[PDB]
Amino acid sequence: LPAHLLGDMWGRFWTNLYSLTVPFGQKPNIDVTDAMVDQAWDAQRIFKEAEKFFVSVGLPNMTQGFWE
Amino acid sequence: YGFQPTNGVGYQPYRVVVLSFELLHAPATVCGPKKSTNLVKNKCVNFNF
Numbered sequence: 001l002p003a004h005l006l007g008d009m010w011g012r013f014w015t016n017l018y019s020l021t022v023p024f025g026q027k028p029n030i031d032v033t034d035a036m037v038d039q040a041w042d043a044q045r046i047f048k049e050a051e052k053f054f055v056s057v058g059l060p061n062m063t064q065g066f067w068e
Numbered sequence: 069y070g071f072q073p074t075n076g077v078g079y080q081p082y083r084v085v086v087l088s089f090e091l092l093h094a095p096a097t098v099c100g101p102k103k104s105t106n107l108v109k110n111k112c113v114n115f116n117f
């Protein structure tokens with residue numbers, strides 16, 4: 001492959017070639033961004049659902065100095 | 069200890085008081101607090117003063 005057609009300056013990641021190499025372009029790759037702005041999720045919900053993921057597996061809470 | 073207000077718990081200062089009761093010998097001293105009520109009048113009663 002020619003070195004200047006790989007998606008970035010050095011060919012380190014091929015991640016910008018997805019729009020040319022997508023297998024089935026008539027199927028939307030799943031994207032939940034509209035369901036976040038339809039339920040009025042603030043800045044704090046994204047971390048509080050993240051803290052509930054880690055307490056789900058058996059890991060400690062955030063340290064409560066973490067929030068201020 | 070260089071204490072700072074932005075220090076995670078377990079690094080913030082705790083004040084401690086250790087009470088140590090040491091008996092020995094005597095005739096009497098401090099003890100519990102007794103209870104009471106409202107004495108009456110003109111009625112056979114069982115009293116403690």
Ligand SMILES: *[C@@H]1O[C@H](CO)[C@@H](O)[C@H](O)[C@H]1NC(C)=O
Nearest residue numbers: 051052055058059060061062
């Ligand atoms: C973590 O925090 C939640 C409330 O924020 C609490 O209900 C839960 O018990 C905490 N986890 C532990 C292990 O105490």
